[PDB]
């Protein structure tokens, strides 16, 4: 049984490192869907730390605006500029895209040559929700193949790292293994094919 733990909205040297420290503690691989505006010298080392530690990096656009009503040119720029900074610092180039706000359109699908991922959410953008509540939301929703959508970076309180102290041991004890998005597709025998114009919340679709 496989799940993919994924984290939006970073990198942030402070907040992302809290998540990476938990993943090191448990020896767990994950995927970070990063925002191009935030990827710069200052954050180069933490981006590279992701790669170095077996994590995957995907594309969450240049900024924090919904993209569904954007023009082809606007979409193209946002996605390309993000890929370029990721390549510069990480040495990789993304295979997956997570639309801002999970908002899609035919135009968005037509103009992004990446596999679109969504996933199970856990209310972890709501600072009043506790570590235990975030963990309960994940643990009760997962099944074999789930993509779990968390945030490494949000306004605080943001006890998502602490939620991982429950999520990771609980799902391991239930027979799950944690994989990157690329690994999830590969191990399930599903080609990573950006010609698929559908959003994956799990693998297989
Ligand atoms: Mg986001």
PDB file of C-alpha atoms and ligand atoms in Angstrom:
ATOM      1  CA  UNK A   1       0.000   0.000   0.000  1.00  0.00           C
ATOM      2  CA  UNK A   2       1.483   3.289  -1.175  1.00  0.00           C
ATOM      3  CA  UNK A   3       0.821   6.979  -0.402  1.00  0.00           C
ATOM      4  CA  UNK A   4       2.469  10.168  -1.522  1.00  0.00           C
ATOM      5  CA  UNK A   5       2.963  12.846   1.044  1.00  0.00           C
ATOM      6  CA  UNK A   6       3.093  16.259  -0.758  1.00  0.00           C
ATOM      7  CA  UNK A   7       3.659  19.828   0.459  1.00  0.00           C
ATOM      8  CA  UNK A   8       2.631  23.097  -1.185  1.00  0.00           C
ATOM      9  CA  UNK A   9       3.538  26.790  -0.988  1.00  0.00           C
ATOM     10  CA  UNK A  10       7.256  26.834  -0.155  1.00  0.00           C
ATOM     11  CA  UNK A  11      10.177  26.921   0.046  1.00  0.00           C
ATOM     12  CA  UNK A  12      10.666  28.811   3.288  1.00  0.00           C
ATOM     13  CA  UNK A  13      14.046  28.378   4.988  1.00  0.00           C
ATOM     14  CA  UNK A  14      12.439  28.187   8.422  1.00  0.00           C
ATOM     15  CA  UNK A  15       9.096  26.465   7.861  1.00  0.00           C
ATOM     16  CA  UNK A  16      10.216  24.021   5.138  1.00  0.00           C
ATOM     17  CA  UNK A  17      13.171  22.934   7.297  1.00  0.00           C
ATOM     18  CA  UNK A  18      10.700  21.925  10.014  1.00  0.00           C
ATOM     19  CA  UNK A  19       9.045  19.516   7.580  1.00  0.00           C
ATOM     20  CA  UNK A  20      12.387  18.248   6.202  1.00  0.00           C
ATOM     21  CA  UNK A  21      13.581  17.558   9.773  1.00  0.00           C
ATOM     22  CA  UNK A  22      10.519  15.333  10.409  1.00  0.00           C
ATOM     23  CA  UNK A  23      11.060  13.504   7.114  1.00  0.00           C
ATOM     24  CA  UNK A  24      14.696  12.880   8.091  1.00  0.00           C
ATOM     25  CA  UNK A  25      13.620  11.588  11.526  1.00  0.00           C
ATOM     26  CA  UNK A  26      11.340   8.993   9.918  1.00  0.00           C
ATOM     27  CA  UNK A  27      13.454   8.392   6.815  1.00  0.00           C
ATOM     28  CA  UNK A  28      10.503   9.323   4.609  1.00  0.00           C
ATOM     29  CA  UNK A  29      10.492  10.675   1.033  1.00  0.00           C
ATOM     30  CA  UNK A  30       7.987  13.304  -0.084  1.00  0.00           C
ATOM     31  CA  UNK A  31       7.236  15.768  -2.877  1.00  0.00           C
ATOM     32  CA  UNK A  32       7.362  19.594  -2.580  1.00  0.00           C
ATOM     33  CA  UNK A  33       5.220  21.664  -4.980  1.00  0.00           C
ATOM     34  CA  UNK A  34       7.147  24.938  -4.954  1.00  0.00           C
ATOM     35  CA  UNK A  35       6.251  28.503  -5.856  1.00  0.00           C
ATOM     36  CA  UNK A  36       8.690  30.164  -8.237  1.00  0.00           C
ATOM     37  CA  UNK A  37       8.711  33.576  -6.427  1.00  0.00           C
ATOM     38  CA  UNK A  38      10.158  31.858  -3.401  1.00  0.00           C
ATOM     39  CA  UNK A  39      13.006  30.034  -5.179  1.00  0.00           C
ATOM     40  CA  UNK A  40      16.135  32.186  -5.118  1.00  0.00           C
ATOM     41  CA  UNK A  41      19.700  32.280  -3.860  1.00  0.00           C
ATOM     42  CA  UNK A  42      18.361  32.543  -0.279  1.00  0.00           C
ATOM     43  CA  UNK A  43      16.435  29.275  -0.686  1.00  0.00           C
ATOM     44  CA  UNK A  44      18.834  27.444  -3.029  1.00  0.00           C
ATOM     45  CA  UNK A  45      20.358  25.259  -0.340  1.00  0.00           C
ATOM     46  CA  UNK A  46      17.011  24.104   1.042  1.00  0.00           C
ATOM     47  CA  UNK A  47      15.743  23.331  -2.484  1.00  0.00           C
ATOM     48  CA  UNK A  48      18.912  21.298  -3.034  1.00  0.00           C
ATOM     49  CA  UNK A  49      18.459  19.614   0.347  1.00  0.00           C
ATOM     50  CA  UNK A  50      15.142  18.268  -0.988  1.00  0.00           C
ATOM     51  CA  UNK A  51      16.887  16.597  -3.928  1.00  0.00           C
ATOM     52  CA  UNK A  52      19.803  15.428  -1.813  1.00  0.00           C
ATOM     53  CA  UNK A  53      17.410  13.707   0.623  1.00  0.00           C
ATOM     54  CA  UNK A  54      15.459  11.768  -2.026  1.00  0.00           C
ATOM     55  CA  UNK A  55      12.487  14.117  -2.252  1.00  0.00           C
ATOM     56  CA  UNK A  56      10.900  15.282  -5.507  1.00  0.00           C
ATOM     57  CA  UNK A  57      10.127  18.870  -6.544  1.00  0.00           C
ATOM     58  CA  UNK A  58       7.053  19.818  -8.549  1.00  0.00           C
ATOM     59  CA  UNK A  59       5.620  23.086  -9.859  1.00  0.00           C
ATOM     60  CA  UNK A  60       2.980  25.151  -7.953  1.00  0.00           C
ATOM     61  CA  UNK A  61       3.302  28.151 -10.358  1.00  0.00           C
ATOM     62  CA  UNK A  62       5.243  31.404 -10.058  1.00  0.00           C
ATOM     63  CA  UNK A  63       2.898  32.883  -7.447  1.00  0.00           C
ATOM     64  CA  UNK A  64      -0.311  32.401  -5.445  1.00  0.00           C
ATOM     65  CA  UNK A  65      -2.950  33.473  -8.007  1.00  0.00           C
ATOM     66  CA  UNK A  66      -5.569  31.113  -9.430  1.00  0.00           C
ATOM     67  CA  UNK A  67      -4.619  30.290 -13.006  1.00  0.00           C
ATOM     68  CA  UNK A  68      -7.835  28.998 -14.568  1.00  0.00           C
ATOM     69  CA  UNK A  69      -8.833  32.300 -16.203  1.00  0.00           C
ATOM     70  CA  UNK A  70      -5.308  33.235 -17.231  1.00  0.00           C
ATOM     71  CA  UNK A  71      -4.249  33.574 -20.899  1.00  0.00           C
ATOM     72  CA  UNK A  72      -1.937  31.057 -22.561  1.00  0.00           C
ATOM     73  CA  UNK A  73       0.878  33.569 -22.400  1.00  0.00           C
ATOM     74  CA  UNK A  74       0.324  34.180 -18.646  1.00  0.00           C
ATOM     75  CA  UNK A  75       0.192  30.464 -17.940  1.00  0.00           C
ATOM     76  CA  UNK A  76       3.276  29.700 -20.015  1.00  0.00           C
ATOM     77  CA  UNK A  77       5.335  32.342 -18.311  1.00  0.00           C
ATOM     78  CA  UNK A  78       4.348  31.324 -14.801  1.00  0.00           C
ATOM     79  CA  UNK A  79       5.135  27.658 -15.389  1.00  0.00           C
ATOM     80  CA  UNK A  80       8.399  28.219 -17.390  1.00  0.00           C
ATOM     81  CA  UNK A  81       9.855  30.760 -15.012  1.00  0.00           C
ATOM     82  CA  UNK A  82       9.199  28.354 -12.089  1.00  0.00           C
ATOM     83  CA  UNK A  83      10.811  25.446 -13.902  1.00  0.00           C
ATOM     84  CA  UNK A  84      13.855  27.584 -14.684  1.00  0.00           C
ATOM     85  CA  UNK A  85      14.598  28.512 -11.062  1.00  0.00           C
ATOM     86  CA  UNK A  86      14.034  24.937  -9.945  1.00  0.00           C
ATOM     87  CA  UNK A  87      16.502  23.694 -12.580  1.00  0.00           C
ATOM     88  CA  UNK A  88      19.047  26.298 -11.566  1.00  0.00           C
ATOM     89  CA  UNK A  89      19.214  25.304  -7.893  1.00  0.00           C
ATOM     90  CA  UNK A  90      17.951  21.713  -7.827  1.00  0.00           C
ATOM     91  CA  UNK A  91      19.370  20.418 -11.085  1.00  0.00           C
ATOM     92  CA  UNK A  92      16.005  18.844 -11.926  1.00  0.00           C
ATOM     93  CA  UNK A  93      12.965  19.700 -14.030  1.00  0.00           C
ATOM     94  CA  UNK A  94       9.440  19.141 -12.783  1.00  0.00           C
ATOM     95  CA  UNK A  95       7.139  16.306 -13.967  1.00  0.00           C
ATOM     96  CA  UNK A  96       4.104  17.399 -11.936  1.00  0.00           C
ATOM     97  CA  UNK A  97       2.000  20.554 -11.527  1.00  0.00           C
ATOM     98  CA  UNK A  98      -0.416  21.417  -8.743  1.00  0.00           C
ATOM     99  CA  UNK A  99      -2.808  24.180  -9.835  1.00  0.00           C
ATOM    100  CA  UNK A 100      -3.066  27.132  -7.425  1.00  0.00           C
ATOM    101  CA  UNK A 101      -6.271  26.679  -5.433  1.00  0.00           C
ATOM    102  CA  UNK A 102      -6.863  23.382  -7.297  1.00  0.00           C
ATOM    103  CA  UNK A 103      -8.599  25.511  -9.970  1.00  0.00           C
ATOM    104  CA  UNK A 104      -8.457  24.188 -13.551  1.00  0.00           C
ATOM    105  CA  UNK A 105      -9.880  25.018 -16.980  1.00  0.00           C
ATOM    106  CA  UNK A 106      -9.453  23.582 -20.478  1.00  0.00           C
ATOM    107  CA  UNK A 107      -7.075  26.449 -21.184  1.00  0.00           C
ATOM    108  CA  UNK A 108      -4.930  25.604 -18.158  1.00  0.00           C
ATOM    109  CA  UNK A 109      -4.790  21.922 -19.108  1.00  0.00           C
ATOM    110  CA  UNK A 110      -3.958  22.896 -22.747  1.00  0.00           C
ATOM    111  CA  UNK A 111      -1.034  25.091 -21.775  1.00  0.00           C
ATOM    112  CA  UNK A 112       0.760  23.056 -19.076  1.00  0.00           C
ATOM    113  CA  UNK A 113       2.752  20.004 -20.261  1.00  0.00           C
ATOM    114  CA  UNK A 114       3.007  18.473 -16.779  1.00  0.00           C
ATOM    115  CA  UNK A 115       0.924  15.857 -14.952  1.00  0.00           C
ATOM    116  CA  UNK A 116      -1.723  17.622 -12.826  1.00  0.00           C
ATOM    117  CA  UNK A 117      -2.043  16.496  -9.203  1.00  0.00           C
ATOM    118  CA  UNK A 118      -4.539  17.404  -6.499  1.00  0.00           C
ATOM    119  CA  UNK A 119      -5.030  15.112  -3.533  1.00  0.00           C
ATOM    120  CA  UNK A 120      -6.673  14.578  -0.157  1.00  0.00           C
ATOM    121  CA  UNK A 121      -6.657  17.773   1.906  1.00  0.00           C
ATOM    122  CA  UNK A 122      -6.536  18.056   5.688  1.00  0.00           C
ATOM    123  CA  UNK A 123      -7.616  21.614   6.587  1.00  0.00           C
ATOM    124  CA  UNK A 124      -3.969  22.469   7.335  1.00  0.00           C
ATOM    125  CA  UNK A 125      -4.306  26.018   5.999  1.00  0.00           C
ATOM    126  CA  UNK A 126      -6.634  26.799   8.943  1.00  0.00           C
ATOM    127  CA  UNK A 127      -4.408  27.881  11.896  1.00  0.00           C
ATOM    128  CA  UNK A 128      -6.989  27.054  14.526  1.00  0.00           C
ATOM    129  CA  UNK A 129      -6.757  23.317  13.639  1.00  0.00           C
ATOM    130  CA  UNK A 130      -4.297  21.305  15.742  1.00  0.00           C
ATOM    131  CA  UNK A 131      -1.601  18.766  14.867  1.00  0.00           C
ATOM    132  CA  UNK A 132      -3.904  16.000  16.070  1.00  0.00           C
ATOM    133  CA  UNK A 133      -6.797  17.226  13.900  1.00  0.00           C
ATOM    134  CA  UNK A 134      -4.601  17.518  10.805  1.00  0.00           C
ATOM    135  CA  UNK A 135      -3.290  14.013  11.390  1.00  0.00           C
ATOM    136  CA  UNK A 136      -6.787  12.582  11.951  1.00  0.00           C
ATOM    137  CA  UNK A 137      -7.916  14.155   8.680  1.00  0.00           C
ATOM    138  CA  UNK A 138      -5.102  12.469   6.756  1.00  0.00           C
ATOM    139  CA  UNK A 139      -5.199   9.060   8.484  1.00  0.00           C
ATOM    140  CA  UNK A 140      -8.946   8.595   8.086  1.00  0.00           C
ATOM    141  CA  UNK A 141      -8.947   9.634   4.413  1.00  0.00           C
ATOM    142  CA  UNK A 142      -6.044   7.718   2.987  1.00  0.00           C
ATOM    143  CA  UNK A 143      -6.314   4.585   0.880  1.00  0.00           C
ATOM    144  CA  UNK A 144      -3.823   2.757  -1.299  1.00  0.00           C
ATOM    145  CA  UNK A 145      -2.658   5.241  -3.923  1.00  0.00           C
ATOM    146  CA  UNK A 146      -3.754   8.479  -2.202  1.00  0.00           C
ATOM    147  CA  UNK A 147      -1.880  11.714  -2.882  1.00  0.00           C
ATOM    148  CA  UNK A 148      -1.924  13.684   0.419  1.00  0.00           C
ATOM    149  CA  UNK A 149      -2.030  17.498  -0.022  1.00  0.00           C
ATOM    150  CA  UNK A 150      -0.435  19.347   2.937  1.00  0.00           C
ATOM    151  CA  UNK A 151       1.326  22.726   3.151  1.00  0.00           C
ATOM    152  CA  UNK A 152       4.897  23.182   4.356  1.00  0.00           C
ATOM    153  CA  UNK A 153       4.349  26.937   4.419  1.00  0.00           C
ATOM    154  CA  UNK A 154       1.284  28.820   5.802  1.00  0.00           C
ATOM    155  CA  UNK A 155       0.745  31.648   8.283  1.00  0.00           C
ATOM    156  CA  UNK A 156       1.227  30.433  11.848  1.00  0.00           C
ATOM    157  CA  UNK A 157       0.192  28.631  13.955  1.00  0.00           C
ATOM    158  CA  UNK A 158       1.093  25.941  11.460  1.00  0.00           C
ATOM    159  CA  UNK A 159       1.523  22.570  13.243  1.00  0.00           C
ATOM    160  CA  UNK A 160       1.804  20.483  10.061  1.00  0.00           C
ATOM    161  CA  UNK A 161       5.314  19.223  11.021  1.00  0.00           C
ATOM    162  CA  UNK A 162       3.898  18.042  14.357  1.00  0.00           C
ATOM    163  CA  UNK A 163       1.020  16.319  12.530  1.00  0.00           C
ATOM    164  CA  UNK A 164       3.649  14.187  10.761  1.00  0.00           C
ATOM    165  CA  UNK A 165       4.637  12.687  14.161  1.00  0.00           C
ATOM    166  CA  UNK A 166       1.214  10.994  14.120  1.00  0.00           C
ATOM    167  CA  UNK A 167       0.673  10.494  10.371  1.00  0.00           C
ATOM    168  CA  UNK A 168       3.945   8.768   9.551  1.00  0.00           C
ATOM    169  CA  UNK A 169       4.002   6.186  12.411  1.00  0.00           C
ATOM    170  CA  UNK A 170       0.274   5.479  12.094  1.00  0.00           C
ATOM    171  CA  UNK A 171       0.308   4.844   8.369  1.00  0.00           C
ATOM    172  CA  UNK A 172       3.518   2.769   8.602  1.00  0.00           C
ATOM    173  CA  UNK A 173       1.891   0.622  11.278  1.00  0.00           C
ATOM    174  CA  UNK A 174      -1.095   0.124   8.915  1.00  0.00           C
ATOM    175  CA  UNK A 175       1.140  -1.239   6.154  1.00  0.00           C
ATOM    176  CA  UNK A 176       1.674   1.902   4.077  1.00  0.00           C
ATOM    177  CA  UNK A 177       4.957   2.973   2.497  1.00  0.00           C
ATOM    178  CA  UNK A 178       5.638   6.606   1.591  1.00  0.00           C
ATOM    179  CA  UNK A 179       6.804   7.423  -1.939  1.00  0.00           C
ATOM    180  CA  UNK A 180       7.464  10.429  -4.177  1.00  0.00           C
ATOM    181  CA  UNK A 181       4.948  11.190  -6.957  1.00  0.00           C
ATOM    182  CA  UNK A 182       7.282   9.746  -9.575  1.00  0.00           C
ATOM    183  CA  UNK A 183       7.726   6.618  -7.487  1.00  0.00           C
ATOM    184  CA  UNK A 184       3.966   6.277  -6.923  1.00  0.00           C
ATOM    185  CA  UNK A 185       3.293   6.268 -10.671  1.00  0.00           C
ATOM    186  CA  UNK A 186       6.258   3.979 -11.459  1.00  0.00           C
ATOM    187  CA  UNK A 187       5.508   1.388  -8.772  1.00  0.00           C
ATOM    188  CA  UNK A 188       1.839   1.275  -9.859  1.00  0.00           C
ATOM    189  CA  UNK A 189       2.803   0.883 -13.540  1.00  0.00           C
ATOM    190  CA  UNK A 190       1.065   4.133 -14.612  1.00  0.00           C
ATOM    191  CA  UNK A 191       3.047   6.135 -17.214  1.00  0.00           C
ATOM    192  CA  UNK A 192       3.840   9.702 -16.147  1.00  0.00           C
ATOM    193  CA  UNK A 193       2.115  11.125 -19.199  1.00  0.00           C
ATOM    194  CA  UNK A 194       1.344  14.857 -19.421  1.00  0.00           C
ATOM    195  CA  UNK A 195      -0.938  14.191 -22.393  1.00  0.00           C
ATOM    196  CA  UNK A 196      -3.405  13.066 -19.736  1.00  0.00           C
ATOM    197  CA  UNK A 197      -5.649  16.096 -19.229  1.00  0.00           C
ATOM    198  CA  UNK A 198      -7.079  15.038 -15.888  1.00  0.00           C
ATOM    199  CA  UNK A 199      -6.200  15.887 -12.286  1.00  0.00           C
ATOM    200  CA  UNK A 200      -4.886  12.962 -10.222  1.00  0.00           C
ATOM    201  CA  UNK A 201      -6.059  12.829  -6.603  1.00  0.00           C
ATOM    202  CA  UNK A 202      -4.771   9.252  -6.391  1.00  0.00           C
ATOM    203  CA  UNK A 203      -2.977   6.680  -8.535  1.00  0.00           C
ATOM    204  CA  UNK A 204      -4.484   5.112 -10.579  1.00  0.00           C
ATOM    205  CA  UNK A 205      -7.051   7.766 -11.460  1.00  0.00           C
TER     206      UNK A 205
HETATM  207 MG1  LIG B   1      -1.055  26.796  -2.667  1.00  0.00          MG
END
